[PDB]
Design a protein around this ligand. Structure first.
Ligand code: HEM
Ligand code: HEM
Ligand code: HEM
Ligand code: HEM
Lengths: 146, 141, 146, 141
């Protein structure tokens, strides 16, 4: 997407400090908790009945890790989010039947998780660089839908 | 907030679709699927191709539900309750699709009720489909 | 905008049958009537107190045909909507302070107006090509927002 | 509709903002103008530069309004009817923008009440901002 380099840099530096393993589990669990209809896709995941059932479900914690590594790869190919994500775009569509609006909810929840973790360190400006990225990743994922 | 003109507006356009409600239903669905391909994510089990007997049946059901909302405009909450239940707890359709379908039914009506599809009746049906939407997404969370 | 030349041909054919005088007055008219808060921008046309007051105003009218003609112009440039509307984009941002979200509203109203008019001829397939167009123009108009 | 549980969560989180509500409302506005510049179309008369007194000045008022909806959680429509009228007939702010400022207030709370910004509290506060935005845009047409 059209990040500016001081934008690319500020995103990059922060991403530097993220624990992907724990942060993926968190954004994924928070999605399932604030937008409960999104649980329609994770029924084989067991108990999603309460916030703790969701938040410590090892199945959610482990999927969260897969989603964030994929995300991670994305941040390395910021010039080419579309091809980066095209086989994942086709998977979510044709086999998963995932409405792309879910990609947008997730990005919003993730920004919430960056702020919750970095505090003051997640500034308005850093927030604006990340809003751009999540939008760039949601679009790349929605790209192969037909 | 449906005003008495709005409610009137709506009872007259809709009384006119009359025996065609079902075809307008199937028609609004086909325009949605083509114009907004993401909405097809919800009907993975349907034959979505042109003239589908599946899309047909479905149009009727949607049009039947509108008809009954029309006739209970006054208590849409209670009248559409089984359905916000269904949508909220079983189908779990993301709220943003409600606007896409709404638009598509607005466009089917314009194309079919040239004479009644007046600006003031246009503003009314729009407000109408918008409160049906709200009622149907009221128990999501 | 990723239109098919078959979609480009269906858009093009329909557009050649369009009474711009009648369709622009009608599209601008119903925007002010369906979404009454878009009237804060046209305060100066004057009396916009009713469908009929609105629909009747020759300012509304002269201004709808003016808008429909910038639209025509971009249908002649489907290839570069952004380059075609950069200046129009900058004026609406820097001069008129218009939320691009209104761009979106106007495209949907246009689509109801082309349906209203072509009845039977405005098929799902033609509606679909026109949805893309209106989305493209909205985005191109949104482009120089800063 | 806000459950008891929601109401409890919101009083409790709003509870710790306390004396920073205004400083948090200023900060939320700033996040908003910077992550979605289109919202700036409504503040063409304001100085939107960092530290702008105008901005601090407005964040306080917005903060105050929220504090009062929390204060009357059980009557939000009546506690806020006046600001709905404002937004509806005077200001005429497209509804989409209520969603952007709700998000930026969540982000601000998250950045400052990490201890309390829990998944249930987060679900609670989202439903509350949603329900405040719904009151503010109820009188549009
Ligand atoms: C940042 C956006 C996302 C990324 C990068 C992402 C990445 C992935 C990856 C890498 C996989 C595994 C692919 C495979 O099994 O071969 C996957 C699977 C899946 N994704 Fe996503 N995903 C994203 C968003 C979402 C959202 C928001 C939802 C629904 C709310 C979703 C629904 C699914 C489902 C249901 C599966 C398969 C789960 C299972 O194994 O049973 N995805 N995703
Ligand atoms: C104007 C708003 C809507 C109305 C009045 C409506 C009405 C209905 C009705 C009457 C049924 C059938 C229930 C039955 O046989 O028990 C149904 C089912 C269904 N609806 Fe909706 N609906 C609306 C919006 C939506 C939207 C926007 C979507 C997705 C884009 C959606 C997706 C579904 C699905 C997936 C089913 C299940 C269909 C089947 O499997 O047979 N609905 N709806
Ligand atoms: C849908 C795409 C749109 C296009 C192609 C467009 C195009 C135009 C054109 C061609 C003009 C004349 C500019 C000039 O003569 O200097 C103009 C002016 C203007 N536009 Fe738009 N416009 C669009 C949407 C909108 C919408 C939806 C609104 C408001 C709801 C809006 C608000 C205005 C205003 C307030 C002016 C100033 C006109 C006057 O006072 O005479 N525009 N636009
Ligand atoms: C949902 C949360 C919101 C709250 C609680 C809120 C509250 C308020 C308050 C308390 C005021 C000052 C009115 C007065 O002086 O009595 C106000 C004015 C205003 N609001 Fe909001 N508002 C909200 C959403 C929005 C949004 C989303 C926008 C636009 C992006 C907006 C734009 C404005 C503007 C332009 C003014 C007048 C500013 C001025 O002229 O000084 N509001 N609002």
């Amino acid at each position: 997407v059209h990040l500016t380099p001081e934008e690319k840099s500020a995103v990059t530096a922060l991403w530097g400090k993220v624990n992907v393993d724990e942060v993926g589990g968190e954004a994924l669990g928070r999605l399932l908790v604030v937008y409960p209809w999104t649980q329609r896709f994770f029924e084989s995941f067991g108990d999603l009945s309460t916030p703790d059932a969701v938040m410590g479900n090892p199945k959610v914690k482990a999927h969260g890790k897969k989603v964030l590594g994929a995300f991670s790869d994305g941040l390395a190919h910021l010039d080419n989010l579309k091809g980066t994500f095209a086989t994942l775009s086709e998977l979510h569509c044709d086999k998963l039947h995932v409405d792309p609006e879910n990609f947008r909810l997730l990005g919003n929840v993730l920004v919430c998780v960056l702020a919750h973790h970095f505090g003051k360190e997640f500034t308005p400006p850093v927030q604006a660089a990340y809003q751009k990225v999540v939008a760039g990743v949601a679009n790349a994922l929605a790209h192969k839908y037909h | 907030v449906l005003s008495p003109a709005d409610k009137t507006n709506v009872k007259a356009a809709w009384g006119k679709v009359g025996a065609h409600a079902g075809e307008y239903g199937a028609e609004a669905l086909e325009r949605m699927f083509l114009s907004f391909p993401t909405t097809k994510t919800y009907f993975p089990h349907f034959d979505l191709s042109h003239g589908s007997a599946q899309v047909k049946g479905h149009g009727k059901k949607v049009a039947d539900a509108l008809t009954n909302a029309v006739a209970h405009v006054d208590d849409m909450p209670n009248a559409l309750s089984a359905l916000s239940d269904l949508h909220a707890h079983k189908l779990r359709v993301d709220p943003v699709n409600f606007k896409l379908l709404s638009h598509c039914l607005l466009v089917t009506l314009a194309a079919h009720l040239p004479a009644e599809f007046t600006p003031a009746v246009h503003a009314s049906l729009d407000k109408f489909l918008a409160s049906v939407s709200t009622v149907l997404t009221s128990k999501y969370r």
